[PDB]
Write an enzyme that holds these catalytic residues in place. Structure first.
Site, PDB file in Angstrom:
ATOM      1  N   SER A 170     -11.793   0.242 -12.464  1.00  0.00           N
ATOM      2  CA  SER A 170     -12.940   1.051 -12.855  1.00  0.00           C
ATOM      3  C   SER A 170     -12.726   1.744 -14.207  1.00  0.00           C
ATOM      4  O   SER A 170     -13.635   1.811 -15.029  1.00  0.00           O
ATOM      5  CB  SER A 170     -13.241   2.089 -11.780  1.00  0.00           C
ATOM      6  OG  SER A 170     -13.212   1.524 -10.473  1.00  0.00           O
ATOM      7  N   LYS A 178      -5.237  -1.461  -3.048  1.00  0.00           N
ATOM      8  CA  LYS A 178      -5.406  -0.170  -3.648  1.00  0.00           C
ATOM      9  C   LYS A 178      -6.620   0.517  -2.992  1.00  0.00           C
ATOM     10  O   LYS A 178      -7.731  -0.012  -3.040  1.00  0.00           O
ATOM     11  CB  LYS A 178      -5.617  -0.315  -5.167  1.00  0.00           C
ATOM     12  CG  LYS A 178      -6.047   0.989  -5.825  1.00  0.00           C
ATOM     13  CD  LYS A 178      -6.607   0.801  -7.189  1.00  0.00           C
ATOM     14  CE  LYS A 178      -7.132   2.117  -7.735  1.00  0.00           C
ATOM     15  NZ  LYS A 178      -7.572   1.965  -9.171  1.00  0.00           N
TER      16      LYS A 178
END
Ligand SMILES: [K+]
Ligand SMILES: [K+]
Ligand SMILES: [K+]
Ligand SMILES: [K+]
Ligand code: NA
Ligand code: NA
Ligand code: NA
Ligand code: NA
Lengths: 295, 295, 295, 295
Positions: free
Chosen positions: C45, C164
Site C-alpha cells: 500500500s 502479512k
C-alpha cells in the site's frame, strides 16, 4: 386501531436542578396541541427516557394524558431491556392512559438479539399488553435494525398494529409495507427528513422530532403527500432536510431543546451526561435553520 | 447536455476461456436496444471493469458504440485510482465514442480521500475531459460516499453534468438535488430498488442493473413516476425491491448473469476471482424473482 | 523459504512532474540498506502501487533489486483485482528478481469475496507462481479481512509461505499462528504499532511503514522481543505507537513522505489524488514524533 | 488501592420462573473462590445487569459480598445511563460492601457521548463516590470506545483508579498505559483472549468471562506472564482464544451458562429476551472447547 398521522416525540423538560418540569411540559403541550397532529409520542428517544426513574416515566405519561384532548393518540415509550420489565412498564402505562405502547428493540446484547429473540420479546409484550403495540426500530441509538423477517412475522399478531422505523432506508420501508400488505400494520417514518419518500413507499405517518418546532410545516408536508401535490411536497421536503438533521443526527436532543428555546417553547437543559452545545455548534444549528428560511 | 432517463449498466460477457465475448455482448445489446432506455452505461461496477485490461476497456466501449443508435447515450466508466490515469482513460474513451465519462471515486486510500482530494481529482478530469463528466458514488464497492459539500462544489463546474448515486439514501439525494438546484446538474439513482423515491426527491433517472432483465418494468416505473401515477408506481416499485437486491447486494454480478441466462440473454460466467452461485444461492435468487411474479 | 524479520514497505518517489524518480529511490534504498532489515517490501500500500502503470510496477521492482544485496529478500506487491492479471504480474515480477510475491486480497467486489473465492484466487496464483506467495490482508485499504478459515486452508499449500496481516487484531494473529502451527507458514505484523504483541503471539516479523524513518528503532524492537527483553521492548513499543499511527492511519503516505523529508530522506510528493498535508496536519505529525522523543 | 489480578465477571443465576437464584449464586461463588482470583466483578455485562431491578442489583452485590473473603476485591457494576442515577447506584453499592465501582460508559445517545460528556459524567461519579472508580469500556455492547484523551484526563482524578477495556485493541491499551504512566491508574484486559498481549503492553490484570469455567487456566496465564514464561504463556494463550470467543462474541451469556452447566457449575437460563442456544450452536460451542483440549 388507526395510528396514521404526524406525532412529535415530546421532550421531557427539566428545571435548573434537573427535576422534571411538569409546568413547562404542560405549557409546551398546550402550544403543540394547536397543530393537526394525530397525537403525542411520549418517551421516545427524544424524551430522554433512559434518564428517568420508573415513576417519572409513569408520571410523565400521566401528565401528557391530562394535557391532551381524549381524541388525540398517546403513544407511550414502554420498552425496557428485559421482556418482563417491558410487560410491566406497558401495563402501567396503559393504566395512566396510553393508547398504544411503542416498544424499542432491546439492544444491550445486540450479539444475541436475533430475529427469534426479538420475535419472542415482542410476541410476549403483545400477548400481555392491554393496549396495541407499535414496533420501534432506531439503529442510531441501538446499533440494531429490527430485521424484516421478524417485522413480517410480528405484523400477523392481532395486538401489534405497526412500527416506527428510524433508519431512513426507504427500500427497507417499502419492502416492509409490501410484505405486510395483507395485515393490519401501519408504518410510521421516524423523522421529517424522509417523510415524503416514506409516504411514497406506503408509510402512513411520521414521528418527527422536528415537529416540536416546525409542526405546521411537517403537517403541511403530510397534506401535500396525501393530496398528490408531489411537486410542492418536494420543495417543502428539501427545505426540511438540514433542520431535521440538525436536531437529530447532528446535535441531538440538546440541538432540539436549543431550537425550542429560540422558537419560544421551553427547551431548557438535558439531564447529565447530555451537555450544552458549544458556541460553534449553536452557530451551525442556527445556520441549518436560517439558510433554509425558517429562522 | 441531458442525461435524464434509464440506463442498464451492461455486463461484460466472457467465453469459457475467460476472453471477452464481443459476439454475445453485441447480441445482448441488440435485445436491450428494444427498450426505451436513454442509453447504456458501460463499465460501471456491473461491467467487471476492474478485471479488464486497458485495451479491453477501450475495445468494449468501442463495440458498444457500434451496436447502439447514435441518438442513444453511451456513459463510459473511465475512473481509475490515479488522477492522471483517469484523464487518459477519459480521453481515449471519448475517442472511441463515449458521450459522457462516469468517474468512480478513487477509494484505495479512503483514509486520505477527503473532500479536497476528491474535488481536485474531479476538477482535473473535468478540466481535461473532451466529454462531460458524471460523478459516480458507489460505497458498497468503495467504502466511501462522495461527500455532499464536494458534490455541491463540483456541480458548479461547466463540464460536470450530474452524478449517479448508488448508496440508496434518499435524504442525501434530496439534499443534493436541493443544494445544486441553481446548477446544470442531474441526479441519477444507482439502482431500481429506490428509483421511485429518487424521482420523488428530484432525481431524473436511474442506472439499474435490474434493467438488464426487467427493462420494460424499469422503464414503466419511470413512466409512472414522470406521469404522476404514484399509486401504480408504488405497486410496481414494491415488486422490484427483492429482485433488485437479488442481483445487486445479495448475489452481485454472478446473480445478475444467472438471471440473464434464465431470461434468455447471454449471462455466462464472470472472471475469477468471481465465482458461480452455489445451488442454495441459485434457489434463493429464483425465489426473489418468482415470488414477486417475474419468473 | 524463511521470511522472518523486519521490512520497510518502500515508497515510490516522484518528481515535480509526477514521474517516478528512480535516482531518489536508489538513494533512499542505499540509506535504508544500513539497517539490519531482512529486505524490502516493494509496492505494498505504501508504494502507491494503484497509481502506477504496469510497466512502472515492473521497473520499480527491477531497480529495487539492483539497489539491494542479493542476500536481502525482495517481497513484491503483485496483487491485482483479477486472478489472471495477478498470475501475470507475479510471473513478470519473478522475472525482474522478486524473491516472493505479496498478494493483496481482491476487494472491489467485497460482497462476493467469500472464503471460497479468496481460496481459489490464492490457490491459482500459488499454483502458477514461480516464487513463493505471501497472503496480504489490509482492511483499512480493502474493507475486508482474509477470513481465518481461508488462511488456514491456504497455509497448507506448498507455495504459500506466510502472510502479512495489517488489521492489528492480536487475537486473530494468535489464532492464525495456532491454527497453522503444523504448516510452513510465517506471520508478519503489518505495522510497528503492534509489533511486540505480535511477536508475543507468534508472529516472526513485521512490514512497517515506520521503518522508513525509524529503522534502527524498529530493528531494536525486534531484537528485544527475540531476546526476551520484554520490559525494554515495552518502553520502546509505547514510544512507537503514536509516530506509527501518524504515518499510517492518521496521515497515511503523505505523512510518511513528509516525515522522510524531515529525517533527510527523499519523501517528496505523492501522485494525485493524494494531497499535501495542511499546516495543521503537519503540526500534528510533528507533535507525534517530538513528544515521543524522536525529533 | 491495587486492582491488579484476574476476576471472573460473575453471572446472575435464575430459577425456572426467572427469579434470581441466590442459592446457586452462592454455590457457584464458593466453587470459584478456590481459584487465586483477586476477587469478583459483579454486574458487568456478563451479570445481565440491564435485566435486573434496582433492588436486585443491590441484593446481588450484597450476597456476593457475604459469600466472599473480605480480603478479596468486589468490583461492582454501578453504571446507569444518567449521571445522577449512577452516583446513587454507586453510593448504594458502596453501602452493601463493594470495594470499587466499575462504571460502564453511558451509550444510548452515542451521538452526543463526546469526550467532554464522558469526562464530566466520570468526574461527577468519582467526585461523589465513596469508593474508587474503574472506567469500563465495552464497545461490543455499547457501540462506543471511551476515547484515549478522555481516559488520560480521567486517570488524573484521585478517585479513578483504572479501567477495564473490552475492545481487544492492544495498540490502544499500550497507548493508554504509556500516556497514564505518571498516574495511579491500572489497566485490566476485558477478556482471556488478549490477556497475554495486554500484560505485554502493561495491563496488570483481566476480567474474563472465561474464568467462570477455566479459572485455573486463566490464573496460570497470569502466572506465566508475570514470571517471564512467555513461551509457555503463548501455548496456553493460543488454546484459550476459541473457547474465549465461544463464550463472548460467538454465543455470549447463553454460551457461558451452557458451558458452566457442562463443567458442573450452575449455568441455568438467562432472562428473556436472551434465548437458549440452538442445537447447532451448542454443537459449535462444544467443538471450541473439545478441539482445544478442555472438554
Ligand atoms: K397486526
Ligand atoms: K454543472
Ligand atoms: K505452506
Ligand atoms: K488516578
Ligand atoms: Na398493512
Ligand atoms: Na440542478
Ligand atoms: Na507455522
Ligand atoms: Na499508571
Amino acid at each position: 386501531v388507526d395510528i396514521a398521522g404526524i406525532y412529535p416525540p415530546v421532550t421531557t423538560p427539566f428545571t435548573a436542578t434537573a427535576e422534571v418540569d411538569y409546568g413547562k411540559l404542560e405549557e409546551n403541550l398546550h402550544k403543540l396541541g394547536t397543530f393537526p397532529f394525530r397525537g403525542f409520542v411520549v418517551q421516545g428517544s427524544n424524551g430522554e427516557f433512559p434518564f428517568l426513574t420508573s415513576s417519572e416515566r409513569l408520571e410523565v405519561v400521566s401528565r401528557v394524558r391530562q394535557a391532551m384532548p381524549k381524541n388525540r393518540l398517546l403513544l407511550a415509550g414502554s420498552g425496557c431491556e428485559s421482556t418482563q420489565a417491558t410487560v410491566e412498564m406497558t401495563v402501567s402505562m396503559a393504566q395512566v392512559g396510553a393508547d398504544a405502547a411503542m416498544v424499542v428493540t432491546p439492544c444491550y446484547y445486540r450479539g444475541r438479539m436475533s430475529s427469534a429473540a426479538l420475535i419472542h420479546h415482542y410476541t410476549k409484550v403483545a400477548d400481555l399488553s392491554p393496549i396495541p403495540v407499535v414496533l420501534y426500530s432506531v439503529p442510531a441509538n441501538t446499533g440494531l435494525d429490527l430485521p424484516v423477517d421478524a417485522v413480517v412475522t410480528l405484523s400477523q399478531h392481532p395486538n401489534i398494529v405497526g412500527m416506527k422505523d428510524s433508519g431512513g432506508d426507504v427500500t427497507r420501508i417499502g419492502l416492509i409495507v409490501h410484505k405486510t400488505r395483507k395485515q393490519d400494520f401501519q408504518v410510521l417514518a421516524g423523522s421529517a427528513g424522509f417523510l415524503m419518500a416514506s409516504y411514497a413507499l406506503g408509510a402512513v405517518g411520521g414521528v418527527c422530532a422536528l415537529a416540536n418546532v416546525l409542526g405546521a410545516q411537517v403537517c403541511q408536508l403530510e397534506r401535500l403527500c396525501c393530496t398528490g401535490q408531489w411537486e410542492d411536497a418536494q420543495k417543502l421536503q428539501h427545505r426540511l432536510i438540514e433542520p431535521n438533521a440538525a436536531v437529530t443526527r447532528r446535535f441531538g436532543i440538546p440541538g432540539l431543546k436549543k431550537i425550542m428555546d429560540w422558537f419560544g417553547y421551553y427547551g431548557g437543559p438535558c439531564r447529565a451526561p447530555l451537555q450544552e452545545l458549544s458556541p460553534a455548534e449553536e452557530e451551525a444549528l442556527r445556520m441549518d435553520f436560517t439558510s433554509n428560511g425558517w429562522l
